[PDB]
Enzyme design. Structure first.
Site, PDB file in Angstrom:
ATOM      1  N   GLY A  23       0.830  -1.188   0.000  1.00  0.00           N
ATOM      2  CA  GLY A  23       0.000   0.000   0.000  1.00  0.00           C
ATOM      3  C   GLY A  23       0.870   1.244   0.000  1.00  0.00           C
ATOM      4  O   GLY A  23       0.442   2.315   0.421  1.00  0.00           O
ATOM      5  N   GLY A  48       1.422   3.229  -2.054  1.00  0.00           N
ATOM      6  CA  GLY A  48       0.931   4.274  -2.932  1.00  0.00           C
ATOM      7  C   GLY A  48       1.890   4.596  -4.060  1.00  0.00           C
ATOM      8  O   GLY A  48       2.226   3.729  -4.863  1.00  0.00           O
ATOM      9  N   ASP A  58      -2.999  -7.363  -5.849  1.00  0.00           N
ATOM     10  CA  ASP A  58      -4.003  -7.345  -4.804  1.00  0.00           C
ATOM     11  C   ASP A  58      -3.405  -8.037  -3.590  1.00  0.00           C
ATOM     12  O   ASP A  58      -3.201  -9.254  -3.596  1.00  0.00           O
ATOM     13  CB  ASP A  58      -5.268  -8.066  -5.281  1.00  0.00           C
ATOM     14  CG  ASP A  58      -6.268  -8.296  -4.161  1.00  0.00           C
ATOM     15  OD1 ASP A  58      -6.240  -7.541  -3.164  1.00  0.00           O
ATOM     16  OD2 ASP A  58      -7.094  -9.226  -4.285  1.00  0.00           O
ATOM     17  N   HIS A  78      -4.894  -0.938  10.117  1.00  0.00           N
ATOM     18  CA  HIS A  78      -5.886  -0.310  10.970  1.00  0.00           C
ATOM     19  C   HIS A  78      -7.159   0.047  10.206  1.00  0.00           C
ATOM     20  O   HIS A  78      -8.161   0.428  10.808  1.00  0.00           O
ATOM     21  CB  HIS A  78      -5.282   0.902  11.705  1.00  0.00           C
ATOM     22  CG  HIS A  78      -5.290   2.178  10.923  1.00  0.00           C
ATOM     23  ND1 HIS A  78      -6.423   2.944  10.760  1.00  0.00           N
ATOM     24  CD2 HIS A  78      -4.289   2.849  10.304  1.00  0.00           C
ATOM     25  CE1 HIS A  78      -6.120   4.034  10.078  1.00  0.00           C
ATOM     26  NE2 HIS A  78      -4.831   4.002   9.789  1.00  0.00           N
TER      27      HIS A  78
HETATM   28  N1  LIG Z   1      -6.243  -4.996  -2.664  1.00  0.00           N
HETATM   29  C1  LIG Z   1      -5.293  -4.094  -2.386  1.00  0.00           C
HETATM   30  N2  LIG Z   1      -3.955  -4.370  -2.602  1.00  0.00           N
HETATM   31  C2  LIG Z   1      -2.950  -3.482  -2.336  1.00  0.00           C
HETATM   32  N3  LIG Z   1      -3.168  -2.220  -1.824  1.00  0.00           N
HETATM   33  C3  LIG Z   1      -4.494  -1.939  -1.607  1.00  0.00           C
HETATM   34  C4  LIG Z   1      -5.563  -2.778  -1.849  1.00  0.00           C
HETATM   35  N4  LIG Z   1      -6.785  -2.129  -1.494  1.00  0.00           N
HETATM   36  C5  LIG Z   1      -6.414  -0.958  -1.065  1.00  0.00           C
HETATM   37  N5  LIG Z   1      -5.044  -0.731  -1.090  1.00  0.00           N
HETATM   38  C6  LIG Z   1      -4.245   0.289  -0.752  1.00  0.00           C
HETATM   39  O1  LIG Z   1      -4.423   0.616   0.656  1.00  0.00           O
HETATM   40  C7  LIG Z   1      -3.576   1.732   0.889  1.00  0.00           C
HETATM   41  C8  LIG Z   1      -4.027   2.278   2.308  1.00  0.00           C
HETATM   42  S1  LIG Z   1      -3.042   3.643   2.721  1.00  0.00           S
HETATM   43  C9  LIG Z   1      -2.028   2.920   4.072  1.00  0.00           C
HETATM   44  C10 LIG Z   1      -0.934   3.916   4.370  1.00  0.00           C
HETATM   45  C11 LIG Z   1       0.365   3.860   3.632  1.00  0.00           C
HETATM   46  N6  LIG Z   1       1.176   2.559   3.650  1.00  0.00           N
HETATM   47  C12 LIG Z   1       1.316   5.011   4.157  1.00  0.00           C
HETATM   48  O2  LIG Z   1       2.482   4.735   4.490  1.00  0.00           O
HETATM   49  O3  LIG Z   1       0.794   6.190   4.206  1.00  0.00           O
HETATM   50  C13 LIG Z   1      -3.817   2.625  -0.309  1.00  0.00           C
HETATM   51  O4  LIG Z   1      -2.579   3.109  -0.837  1.00  0.00           O
HETATM   52  C14 LIG Z   1      -4.627   1.674  -1.280  1.00  0.00           C
HETATM   53  O5  LIG Z   1      -4.326   1.900  -2.651  1.00  0.00           O
END
Ligand SMILES: Nc1ncnc2c1ncn2[C@@H]1O[C@H](CSCC[C@H](N)C(=O)O)[C@@H](O)[C@H]1O
Ligand SMILES: Nc1ncnc2c1ncn2[C@@H]1O[C@H](CSCC[C@H](N)C(=O)O)[C@@H](O)[C@H]1O
Ligand SMILES: Oc1ccc2c(c1)OC[C@]1(O)c3cc4c(cc3O[C@H]21)OCO4
Ligand SMILES: Oc1ccc2c(c1)OC[C@]1(O)c3cc4c(cc3O[C@H]21)OCO4
EC number: 2.1.1.46
Lengths: 357, 357
Positions: free
Chosen positions: A200, A202, A243, A261
């Site tokens: 995640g 981003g 995913d 969280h």
């Molecule tokens: N199935 C999936 N696989 C991978 N990432 C996913 C997902 N569903 C949602 N996300 C990802 O969930 C993330 C939550 S943001 C979590 C915070 C981030 N690691 C930081 O350091 O700020 C988002 O970037 C979103 O794109």
């Protein structure tokens, strides 16, 4: 009698009633720029000097004094005695900063000002006047929505709330860079790693910070196909779309920063299981790093637990969100198949959890 | 490094930022009538039972739980384990009251509810959003006036604020009867007295409480001619009209309840000197009793000092009033000609000062 407990009881009751005052006083010290004023001065400052630097009207000086007295007692300033100027004046009290207030000096990587301002902003506090109605209504919503009629997010995106939106963004950006200090203060967590996958991650903001401290670490930013896009990297940086509930690219370690969280236990378990598989090849040497809050009620630092629970209530009243306790983390960790884990307190009340297969 | 102080520093900073949450949580517990709910139940109550008693919508139960967790940690409730009902349910947590929360049980001489409600009412809190402007303006006024445009007193007498005015009155009346407990818990202060003069006793409300505990004490209610009027009493109660700055009727002891905090040092000194003369005839046996706040910064009970300073700030922001420190009292006492004095903490954070010639 046993009723003579009344006093000991009243004290406890009143202290909690008037606690809010200490927060408002801290809020005032940061909005007045007292820290910067003292810092810029270069040495302990007297009432008048501080008053002059703040450009206070004479009538507001005694007010400054009062707040200072309380803040000094709360450890945000240290009193010192300095002789007056030109014989007539005797001795004057001079105020110096303390570790806590130094966190209020603007223009620095450690400045938590934006967070103090945001946490104590009217948009954070006023909603409480709607707490009774909120508890007694049939509609499921945040306290903010109950009091305002709209979600915090919607409220922020109003044009009339643009400045508030900036403030909130300043708070997050500040909370994000605070992570750099986390890395600097806990290099031991990343030292033996050759690779790391930032789940995640981003667009790589977090990985970039990680590379600012560990430039040789091969980092993989893993996220959804649409978020990672075609993004390219370099020798030690690559982007992978997928995913996380299906799988996570293999690496020496899996970083889960503020990721779990936002998920219930069921979904969090899947992520943690895919994380264990992502490091399986590395055997017992692999590890998963979780960065989220962990509330430990059994801790001997009651104050810390209270602060954690306090923050938890803020999450509750504003987003209807929740933070996990140490026990909830342990259950996820063991249910996931891991053998041990270690919690390291970071950023005042957050946690860094090292999880081992 | 020495920068590794950041964590220890952040913790301290955040704890003070989020302190307000503990006050709001206490506010919620009292507005929800949790104390009465548990008290009326007669024994430890489970989440669901409490939820049922409060008539909460199912979605608000987890919210109740959260507040309970924080309040329990803050010592306002005690957790107990009680087996479920009819096999299926296992063990459930049950909440019991603690000395602090028992002060929230309505319909009792010890109920500080009205004060909790008043101290944490929006009219007490919202003004803080105007704190920065307040510090930076040229007009000398209370924070309440700065934020509202009117004095707290005027605000209360509005018709649209009638209920708020009642609430405030309930708080005072409650603060007044709390004095009865003060007498009961400190009979030793009045035991050897044959007579007592209640300066500024108004129409005798305070003297009446004094007579409820010490019916044989000859009490004289001393106040201005216009306030005391022609008022008559009985064997042990009489009214005398005069000017306390000129003289005070003689008696074994002079009571100065909440009288000196409305006067500057100069005026307070006169009153104290006339008080020493009022007891002169009784020689070294006479005494003057002061009931007001006394802040002792050197005290080892930092929390109490903080609470006292907190309250002092409330007086400041709302009335521009002030409370004296132990040292300020000592100076008045000795400047007045007295030999010794003794401070007895009362009502959670107030003081009862025995002054001896
Ligand atoms: N199935 C999936 N696989 C991978 N990432 C996913 C997902 N569903 C949602 N996300 C990802 O969930 C993330 C939550 S943001 C979590 C915070 C981030 N690691 C930081 O350091 O700020 C988002 O970037 C979103 O794109
Ligand atoms: N010159 C004077 N002599 C005597 N009383 C005076 C005075 N000027 C003002 N006062 C009295 O000051 C009192 C302040 S009220 C103080 C509180 C009071 N003893 C209580 O127990 O609640 C008023 O009752 C007022 O009438
Ligand atoms: O990831 C984060 C980092 C900091 C903060 C977060 C979440 O929300 C709670 C908060 O108490 C808060 C609430 C706010 C605000 C800023 C603000 O900062 C604090 O501006 C308006 O309301
Ligand atoms: O002699 C007293 C006794 C209690 C109180 C006083 C003065 O003022 C401060 C206070 O914090 C307060 C402020 C209030 C209120 C009640 C209330 O009670 C508290 O209602 C509105 O604002």
């Amino acid at each position: 009698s046993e009723e003579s407990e009344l006093y000991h009881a009243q004290i406890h009751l009143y202290k909690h009633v008037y606690n809010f005052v200490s927060s408002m006083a801290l809020k005032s010290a940061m909005e007045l720029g007292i820290a910067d004023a003292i810092h810029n001065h270069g040495k302990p400052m007297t009432l008048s000097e501080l008053a002059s630097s703040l450009k206070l009207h004479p009538s507001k000086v005694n007010i400054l004094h009062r707040f200072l007295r309380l803040l000094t007692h709360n450890g945000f300033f240290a009193k010192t005695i300095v002789k007056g100027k030109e014989g007539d004046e005797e001795e004057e009290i001079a105020y110096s900063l303390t570790p806590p207030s130094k966190l209020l000096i603007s223009g620095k990587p450690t400045c938590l000002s934006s967070i103090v301002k945001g946490a104590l902003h009217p948009s954070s506090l006023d909603m409480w006047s709607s707490s009774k109605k909120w508890f007694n209504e049939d509609k499921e919503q945040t306290l903010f929505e109950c009091a305002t009629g709209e979600s915090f997010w919607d409220f922020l995106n109003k044009d009339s709330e643009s400045s508030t939106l900036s403030m909130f963004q300043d708070a997050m950006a500040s909370d994000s860079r605070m992570f750099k200090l986390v890395l600097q203060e806990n290099k031991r967590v990343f030292e033996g790693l050759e690779s790391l996958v930032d789940v995640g991650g981003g667009t790589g903001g977090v990985t970039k910070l990680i590379h600012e401290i560990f430039p040789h670490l091969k980092c993989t930013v893993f996220d959804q196909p649409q978020v990672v896009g075609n993004l390219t990297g370099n020798e030690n940086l690559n982007f992978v779309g997928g995913d996380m509930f299906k799988s996570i690219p293999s690496a020496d370690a899996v970083l889960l920063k503020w990721v779990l969280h936002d998920w219930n236990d069921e979904q969090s378990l899947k992520i943690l299981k895919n994380s264990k598989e992502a490091i399986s090849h590395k055997g017992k040497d692999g590890k998963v790093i979780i960065i989220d809050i962990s509330i430990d009620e059994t801790s001997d630092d009651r104050g810390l637990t209270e602060l954690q629970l306090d923050y938890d209530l803020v999450m509750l009243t504003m987003f209807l969100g929740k933070e996990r306790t140490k026990q909830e983390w342990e259950k996820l960790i063991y249910d996931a198949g891991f053998s041990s884990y270690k919690i390291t307190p970071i950023s005042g009340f957050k946690s860094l959890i090292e999880v081992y297969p």
